Amino acid sequence: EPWTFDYGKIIKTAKILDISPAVIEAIGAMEGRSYADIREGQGAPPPPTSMDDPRLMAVDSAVRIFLYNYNCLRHVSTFNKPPIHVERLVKHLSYEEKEDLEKVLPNVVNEYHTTFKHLRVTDPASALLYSIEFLCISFLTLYEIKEPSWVVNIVREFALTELNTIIQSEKLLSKPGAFNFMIFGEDFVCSGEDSSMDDISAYSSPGLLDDPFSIEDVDISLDVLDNLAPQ
């Protein structure tokens, strides 16, 4: 099967969330940038060329937390108690239909992991687009569902909440704006480029009951130690 990148899925997905397409395309590349620049798409890094680019892991991590949280809702019955991000909206449900939602909700993890590991080794540039596109099509799959009637309102809310948290988690790694520095609870506030408050003992080489060679129970004057010479 020949895979081809589809830009139409990102445009459709971005329109639903009322956000710029550049925000979706910049998953994992938001570090060290202003979100206003990310929103406008200015300063976007070039496509990856190395299989060890942390962007590939960053996008893949965002994909698997969508899948991890989706399956938690899918298997809500098996839990002793559901986690926070899925319990407040399924609370009004009954047990027999809470034991359901694993038959009426389709699986969306069909062939992601196998293909991503192949694309990462073969061509890293296509792997980044594949992981982003997979996140959008999975969101559209969970947003374009229509039957049965009792599940549409419980999954579309989930789809928007998950994709928003993924974007927000990526957003919280960008360049911060302006804020009160004293809300942390202390006077001083250092940065990652500061050396004033570094540990003094850390400048030395890091790292390190009876002494067998110490004359501690031998009462001999320190000025007459030549009596211990081997001779």
- Within residues 23-82, the interface with other proteins by CB under 8 A covers 28, 31-32, 50-54, 56-58, 60-61, 64-65, 67-68, 71-72, 74-76, 78-79
Nearer to other proteins, 11 or 173 (CB): 173
Rounded Cα–Cα distance for residues 197 and 130 (Å): 44
Pick what 28 binds: Mg ion, other proteins, none; C-beta below 5 to 8 Å, kind-dependent: other proteins
Binders of Mg ion in range 191-230 (CB under 5 A): 229
Structure tokens at 103: 């038959």
Q: How far is the CB of 226 from Mg ion (least distance, A)?
A: 6
Q: 3-state DSSP call for residue 228?
A: helix
Q: How far from 59 is each of 26, 42, 62, 119, 183, CA to CA, in Å?
A: 9, 19, 5, 13, 32
Binders of other proteins in range 181-200 (CB under 8 A): 181-200
Nearer to other proteins, 33 or 156 (CB): 33
Nearer to other proteins, 5 or 188 (CB): 188
Q: How far is the CB of 208 from Mg ion (least distance, A)?
A: 36
Structure tokens at 149: 């009637």
Query: Per CB under 8 A, which region of 1-9, 89-97, 139-147, 168-176 contacts other proteins?
Result: 168-176
Tally of residues, the chain:
231
Rounded Cα–Cα distance for residues 98 and 78 (Å): 10
Contact between 11 and other proteins by CB under 8 A: the answer reads no
Rounded Cα–Cα distance for residues 13 and 27 (Å): 14
Nearer to other proteins, 149 or 183 (CB): 183
Contact between 141 and other proteins by CB under 8 A: the answer reads no
Q: SS in 3 state form for 92-156?
A: CCCHHHHCCCCCCCCCCCCCHHHHHHHHHHHCHHHHHHHHHHHHHHHHHHHHCCCCCCCCHHHHH
Binding site for Mg ion (CB under 5 A): 229, 231
